[PDB]
Design a protein around this ligand. Structure first.
Ligand SMILES: CCCCCCCCCCC
Ligand SMILES: C[N+](C)(C)CCOP(=O)(O)O
Ligand SMILES: CC(C)C[C@H](N)C(=O)O
Ligand code: NA
Ligand code: NA
Length: 502
């Protein structure tokens, strides 16, 4: 089995897995919609009672399966629990990262195309009216991804966007095809430091933004000022947990797969804690200090919150660049922004394709080259659905990146810490650890976490079950049908692997 070359490389690889579009796009929006500081408390709690324990659990399962030559859940679940249904459940550790990868890589290609156009300097040129400043950039984005005028089911992506998507796929492939140590680790050691530097620079530049309408400092205060009136709002807790899952790459089967390449004897405790911590630093300190403080700086708090509620891509791809365009060297600043986004995105995407690749290698005994090329083929092909179908992206992000990750986190935790046994699991986690997990967490993993997740899922289901059946748009039914198809496909591949074993 292939292994990480150095501990540093491992850390930066995992951190590259975690740190991504979720930090600089999803987070600012989530925190803004949820009332700034009010969102932080639950967030932190969700980080302590969910993110950390599940992170350690996934590292442990990953290394455990890796020792035996298995980096994916279909096999690992079976090692931990002997059942066919364990394999069937294991299918989600493929389906989820694949589905998420499909749209994620596309958004990444967006960040790339924008990076290029802003570098070369082809951008809308604004003239004191907010709508006259934002409108050009809204039209810019809409022309890029081909957004319809009314609400219409069909998207018309520009040729440039498509070509850039091809290029992005090519970069992902060029990285993944060199393997764990050579392809992924090498790139991590560069992309990560680059990312941190760019992020710091942007944070500082943004912090200097002050106008008659407000300041970046106002945004920082808004984000860091506690509000206890929202603590009774379940939605805030749900959003916090969802964000924790998404940003730490939990429930995507990615962490597990990366961990399967960690040598049996190497420490997963301090490495894991370090990766998670790095992610949170990149999220709250970096991600939260860029978009929001700038928006608040120019338009004030209320307007910034309104913009955040407007959409996830509205703050990142429209508002921010429009704000930069009003400053000296704003185009170049926009470029830096989109380049940062692109590197974070890439470092995540490779991580979410790796599970499929690793299944093809381990279970079907395919060579790395073939596994990578076929994974790329599948992702690229499926991506046309997200490209040409309006609202498809949201559907995938919902079923896979929202519900699926929580369900799968609960499932993996239940299999590892309950069925496989709690003491054996604990010992497996602490084994080889440079430092040891605080005893209290044993009780957090076994009782608190699973209960919390179960409650969450119950609430969610309660709310969504009625809504699902009545939904008007056909695009979503097409998407659902297709991803169900993907699930059947993966299940079939698992069947084939199982048969090959015998
Ligand atoms: C090997 C390490 C390379 C580090 C390069 C950092 C470049 C930062 C540019 C903003
Ligand atoms: C009954 N079941 C389908 C849930 C489990 C069967 O697993 P197995 O005994 O065939 O391995
Ligand atoms: C799906 C995951 C790889 C996403 C990543 N953790 C992020 O924060 O963007
Ligand atoms: Na993240
Ligand atoms: Na990343």
């Amino acid at each position: 089995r292939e292994h990480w070359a150095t501990r540093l490389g491992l850390i930066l690889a995992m951190a590259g897995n975690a740190v991504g579009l979720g930090n600089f796009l999803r987070f600012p929006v989530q925190a803004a919609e949820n009332g700034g500081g009010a969102f932080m408390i639950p967030y932190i709690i969700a980080f302590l009672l969910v993110g950390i324990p599940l992170m350690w659990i996934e590292w442990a399962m990953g290394r455990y399966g890796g020792a035996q030559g298995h980096g994916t859940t279909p096999a690992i679940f079976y090692l931990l629990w002997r059942n066919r249904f364990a394999k069937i459940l294991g299918v989600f550790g493929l389906w989820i990262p694949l589905v998420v990868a499909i749209y994620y890589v596309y958004i990444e290609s967006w960040t790339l195309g924008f990076a290029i156009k802003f570098l070369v300097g082809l951008v809308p040129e604004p003239p004191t009216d907010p709508d006259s400043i934002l409108r050009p950039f809204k039209e810019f984005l809409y022309s890029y991804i081909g957004v319809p005028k009314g609400d219409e089911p069909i998207l018309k992506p520009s040729l440039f966007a498509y070509i850039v998507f091809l290029i992005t796929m090519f970069i992902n492939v060029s990285i993944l095809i060199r393997g764990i140590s050579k392809g992924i680790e090498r790139f991590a050691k560069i992309a990560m430091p680059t990312l941190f530097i760019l992020a710091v620079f942007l944070v500082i530049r943004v912090f200097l933004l002050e106008t008659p309408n407000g300041t970046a400092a106002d945004g920082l205060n808004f984000l860091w000022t506690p509000d206890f009136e929202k603590l009774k709002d379940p939605g805030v807790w749900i959003a916090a947990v969802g964000q924790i899952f998404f940003t730490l790459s939990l429930g995507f089967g990615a962490i597990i797969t990366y961990a399967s390449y960690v040598r049996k004897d190497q420490d997963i405790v301090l490495s894991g804690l370090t990766a998670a911590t790095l992610n949170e630093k990149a999220e709250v300190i970096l991600g939260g200090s860029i978009s929001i403080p700038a928006a608040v700086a120019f338009f004030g708090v209320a307007n910034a919150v309104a913009i955040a509620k407007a959409g996830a891509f509205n703050l990142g791809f429209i508002t921010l660049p429009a704000i930069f365009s009003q400053t000296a060297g704003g185009t170049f600043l926009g470029f830096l922004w989109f380049f940062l986004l692109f590197f974070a995105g890439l470092t995540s995407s490779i991580a979410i394709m790796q599970p499929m690749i690793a299944f093809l290698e381990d279970e079907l005994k395919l060579s790395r080259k073939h596994a990578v090329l076929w994974t790329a083929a599948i992702v690229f092909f499926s991506a046309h659905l997200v490209m040409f179908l309006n609202k498809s992206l949201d559907e995938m992000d919902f079923w896979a990146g929202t519900i699926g990750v929580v369900f799968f986190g609960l499932t993996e935790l239940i299999i590892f810490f309950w069925i496989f046994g709690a003491d054996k699991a604990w010992e497996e986690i602490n084994r080889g650890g440079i430092i040891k997990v605080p005893r209290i967490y044993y009780y957090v993993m076994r009782y608190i976490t699973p209960a919390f997740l179960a409650v969450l899922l119950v609430v969610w289901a309660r709310e969504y079950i009625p809504k699902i059946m009545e939904e008007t748009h056909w695009t979503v039914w097409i998407t659902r049908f297709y991803i169900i198809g993907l699930f059947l496909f993966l299940t079939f591949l698992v069947f084939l692997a199982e048969r090959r074993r015998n």
